[PDB]
Amino acid sequence: ERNQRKVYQGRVVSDKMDKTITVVVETKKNHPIYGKRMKYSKKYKAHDENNTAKVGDIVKIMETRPLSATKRFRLLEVVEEAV
Amino acid sequence: AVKIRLKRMGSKKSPFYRIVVADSRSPRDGRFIETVGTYNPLKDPAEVVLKEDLVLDWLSKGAQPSDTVRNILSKEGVMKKHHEAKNVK
Amino acid sequence: NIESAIKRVRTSANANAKNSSQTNAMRTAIKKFEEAVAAGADNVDALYNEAVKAVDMAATKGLIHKNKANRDKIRLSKLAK
RNA sequence: UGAGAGUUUGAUCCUGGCUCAGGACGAACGCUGGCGGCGUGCCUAAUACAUGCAAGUCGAACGCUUCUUGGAAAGAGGAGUGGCGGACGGGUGAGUAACACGUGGGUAACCUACCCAUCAGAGGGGGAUAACACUUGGAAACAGGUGCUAAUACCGCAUAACAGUUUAUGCCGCAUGGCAUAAGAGUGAAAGGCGCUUUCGGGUGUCGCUGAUGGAUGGACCCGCGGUGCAUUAGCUAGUUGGUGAGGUAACGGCUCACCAAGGCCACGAUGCAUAGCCGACCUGAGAGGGUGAUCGGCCACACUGGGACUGAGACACGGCCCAGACUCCUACGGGAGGCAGCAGUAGGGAAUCUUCGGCAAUGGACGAAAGUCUGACCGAGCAACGCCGCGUGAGUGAAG
RNA sequence: CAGAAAGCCACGGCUAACUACGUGCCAGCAGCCGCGGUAAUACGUAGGUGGCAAGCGUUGUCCGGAUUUAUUGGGCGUAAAGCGAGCGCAGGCGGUUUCUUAAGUCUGAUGUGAAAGCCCCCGGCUCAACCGGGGAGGGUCAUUGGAAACUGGGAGACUUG
Numbered sequence: 026e027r028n029q030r031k032v033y034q035g036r037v038v039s040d041k042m043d044k045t046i047t048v049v050v051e052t053k054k055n056h057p058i059y060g061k062r063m064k065y066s067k068k069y070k071a072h073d074e075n076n077t078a079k080v081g082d083i084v085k086i087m088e089t090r091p092l093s094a095t096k097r098f099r100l101l102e103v104v105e106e107a108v
Numbered sequence: 109a110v111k112i113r114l115k116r117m118g119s120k121k122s123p124f125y126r127i128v129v130a131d132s133r134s135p136r137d138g139r140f141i142e143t144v145g146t147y148n149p150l151k152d153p154a155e156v157v158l159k160e161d162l163v164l165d166w167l168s169k170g171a172q173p174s175d176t177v178r179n180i181l182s183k184e185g186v187m188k189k190h191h192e193a194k195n196v197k
Numbered sequence: 198n199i200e201s202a203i204k205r206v207r208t209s210a211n212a213n214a215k216n217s218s219q220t221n222a223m224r225t226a227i228k229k230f231e232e233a234v235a236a237g238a239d240n241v242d243a244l245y246n247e248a249v250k251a252v253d254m255a256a257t258k259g260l261i262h263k264n265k266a267n268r269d270k271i272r273l274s275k276l277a278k
Numbered sequence: 279u280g281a282g283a284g285u286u287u288g289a290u291c292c293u294g295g296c297u298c299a300g301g302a303c304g305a306a307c308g309c310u311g312g313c314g315g316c317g318u319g320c321c322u323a324a325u326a327c328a329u330g331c332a333a334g335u336c337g338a339a340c341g342c343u344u345c346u347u348g349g350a351a352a353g354a355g356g357a358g359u360g361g362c363g364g365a366c367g368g369g370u371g372a373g374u375a376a377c378a379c380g381u382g383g384g385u386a387a388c389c390u391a392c393c394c395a396u397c398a399g400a401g402g403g404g405g406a407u408a409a410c411a412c413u414u415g416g417a418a419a420c421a422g423g424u425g426c427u428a429a430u431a432c433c434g435c436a437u438a439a440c441a442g443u444u445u446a447u448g449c450c451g452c453a454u455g456g457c458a459u460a461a462g463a464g465u466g467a468a469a470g471g472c473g474c475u476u477u478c479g480g481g482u483g484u485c486g487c488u489g490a491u492g493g494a495u496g497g498a499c500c501c502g503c504g505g506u507g508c509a510u511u512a513g514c515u516a517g518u519u520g521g522u523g524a525g526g527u528a529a530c531g532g533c534u535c536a537c538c539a540a541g542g543c544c545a546c547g548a549u550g551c552a553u554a555g556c557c558g559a560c561c562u563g564a565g566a567g568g569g570u571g572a573u574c575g576g577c578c579a580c581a582c583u584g585g586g587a588c589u590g591a592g593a594c595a596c597g598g599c600c601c602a603g604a605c606u607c608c609u610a611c612g613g614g615a616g617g618c619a620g621c622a623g624u625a626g627g628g629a630a631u632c633u634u635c636g637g638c639a640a641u642g643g644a645c646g647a648a649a650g651u652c653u654g655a656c657c658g659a660g661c662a663a664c665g666c667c668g669c670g671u672g673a674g675u676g677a678a679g
Numbered sequence: 680c681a682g683a684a685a686g687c688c689a690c691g692g693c694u695a696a697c698u699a700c701g702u703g704c705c706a707g708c709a710g711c712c713g714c715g716g717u718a719a720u721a722c723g724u725a726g727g728u729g730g731c732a733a734g735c736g737u738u739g740u741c742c743g744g745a746u747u748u749a750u751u752g753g754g755c756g757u758a759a760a761g762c763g764a765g766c767g768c769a770g771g772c773g774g775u776u777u778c779u780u781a782a783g784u785c786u787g788a789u790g791u792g793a794a795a796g797c798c799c800c801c802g803g804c805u806c807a808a809c810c811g812g813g814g815a816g817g818g819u820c821a822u823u824g825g826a827a828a829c830u831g832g833g834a835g836a837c838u839u840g
Contacts, residue, residue: 209589
């Protein structure tokens with residue numbers, strides 16, 4: 026033990042699946058020719074115990090091991106809740 | 109199965125040779141792990157250009173120096189120093 | 198074509214024959230054990246340790262490497278004794 | 279380290295296209311002879327292959343047989359069992375838009391004889407067989423029957439769980455979980471080989487064998503990011519998406535089965551179509567950036583085409599096998615034989631691209647108590663002015679031409 | 680023994696190199712402008728000269744010259760170029776100010792970016808290429824620590840838009 030996983034504090038988008046939500050991180054980087062800052066994202070399939078976080082919730086996530094057809098994320102901390 | 113060995117750098121008539129240290133799965137002048145020494149193939153008494161720092165470090169891991177390495181490093185006594193500082197250790 | 202590995206071919210053929218016999222012996226030993234456990238009657242310990250002997254002697258006297266023998270003894274002792 | 283020159287009109291200034299002066303033909307000189315230093319040489323058909331060479335080694339694991347010398351045994355030789363290697367080394371870029379590559383990372387979901395470290399150890403037997411002698415079927419390839427025999431070949435029994443759970447104990451971590459001690463159920467061997475002391479001795483040094491933990495070497499899995507044209511290519515998907523449990527796997531996992539739901543991916547380009555092996559690198563540019571992927575080196579993939587496994591830890595195997603297909607040589611016509619994109623060498627294609635020389639002396643493999651044996655790797659040799667070095671084909675003097 | 684050791688394409692301009700004659704709307708030269716056509720440094724001979732140099736012409740392909748895809752580095756009144764005009768989803772950019780934050784940003788330390796590569800320092804092959812020793816280059820990289828001006832996230836304020 027000397028290394029954890031790179032936690033990605035994304036927000037929750039979908040939670041329709043059992044034990045499984047959808048966490049979307051967001052970052053912004055340059056253009057390979059011009060200069061200004063773009064905006065882009067991926068989607069991270071996250072495994073929950075009983076689908077705690079609602080739509081729009083903020084949670085940091087941490088990878089464990091291939092659990093399914095390549096979902097590789099776990100819940101850590103429900104940071105702040107939508108209402 | 110690590111193994112220290114030699115390596116050629118010839119031209120047409122006049123070669124130049126180099127010792128090289130590797131693992132025995134690899135080809136000879138192909139890949140390796142690190143570097144040890146060289147020697148002149150011409151102008152006897154030629155240029156014994158040796159590192160003499162990684163041979164005993166490398167055989168502490170345990171390897172098999174080849175036929176030429178044993179003779180030309182018994183000229184520097186490294187194999188003599190091998191069984192002198194390892195069989196006495 | 199062939200130079201000198203036809204002896205390797207015949208060696209592999211004999212290994213096919215005897216390894217087929219030994220693996221079929223192991224499998225029938227394991228199923229002979231597994232019939233009795235769902236049955237529930239007598240002869241539950243003799244064939245138990247015979248199945249464990251069969252797995253271990255086909256592991257070492259035979260070969261898998263170590264661990265299908267180990268996974269079988271785990272799933273066996275976690276099921277029977 | 280950044281040079282502009284022509285050309286539209288009767289002449290002018292602008293804007294603008296075309297052409298030229300530089301270097302980057304991996305291979306066409308019709309000339310000619312110095313190249314004797316350093317390097318390169320099928321890019322089109324991943325087209326078809328005569329000829330030879332390109333993988334064997336161990337007699338200190340073990341039986342049998344052909345010779346220099348009817349009893350003699352050293353050296354030699356022949357076959358077989360058995361052991362390790364034929365998965366390294368060499369060739370090609372047909373496929374591949376993907377964790378194939380480059381870079382940064384993860385192993386509390388991973389495996390390994392081949393080199394050392396540590397501890398436990400390390401018996402008695404059986405019963406066949408090859409070889410061997412004779413016969414049957416054989417055109418042959420190769421099958422078959424009887425009898426006898428060895429081992430470090432094969433085959434059952436004793437001993438330890440330290441592995442592996444499960445329990446208690448303490449300690450900690452990012453969810454699983456991990457780390458030390460104590461205890462509940464089963465498990466091997468080549469017991470072998472050489473040499474010495476050999477006074478019964480039987481102690482041995484070494485080389486081997488097995489089990490459990492380590493380092494190192496090799497392989498595998500996953501993850502963030504980066505490199506292509508078409509939107510006159512906008513929807514795609516059902517083992518798909520998730521959960522349940524089981525099988526299976528070195529290893530996690532819909533990898534696979536049965537049940538419950540309908541989830542997943544997309545305008546930041548999903549899916550579709552075409553082309554391409556990727557990289558370190560380069561005789562271009564002032565520089566930002568454009569062009570090529572040969573050497574030489576690294577990774578990936580392929581072996582006339584497509585499937586499939588077996589031995590072996592390591593292969594779904596380039597000179598290993600089985601089946602289907604195409605193509606080629608024999609057959610005594612019932613049946614058999616083969617895959618140079620290994621090295622030269624061959625015929626076709628093309629604007630176009632070489633020698634059928636020796637040796638492991640050098641080095642590097644492979645086995646071994648040893649000399650040793652093999653190597654078209656490699657060392658080097660014999661061709662093409664094919665490109666770059668560095669030098670040559672006289673010098674000092676000497677005319678009213 | 681100076682003995683064996685010399686070959687290439689043009690000369691109207693761009694771009695150093697002239698004569699004599701012939702065919703004289705024709706035989707044929709063109710990289711482009713452009714020649715010819717009885718007085719051709721342009722068609723063809725022959726001599727004169729020129730520039731590389733045992734290597735020199737032609738052909739094909741790649742970058743430049745090209746600011747002729749312009750981020751560095753171009754502009755749309757008449758030259759090629761503002762949709763016929765409005766309304767608005769997503770998207771791009773946003774008035775002043777207090778406190779916080781630290782994603783972007785600046786900065787240190789550490790591991791890595793194979794070796795031969797190019798360059799530079801040093802050296803040997805008679806120099807030279809070729810070979811050898813040492814570091815800079817290739818991260819838009821990973822961990823870790825600060826900086827809090829500007830952009831970005833959170834709480835309040837103001838009246839000019």
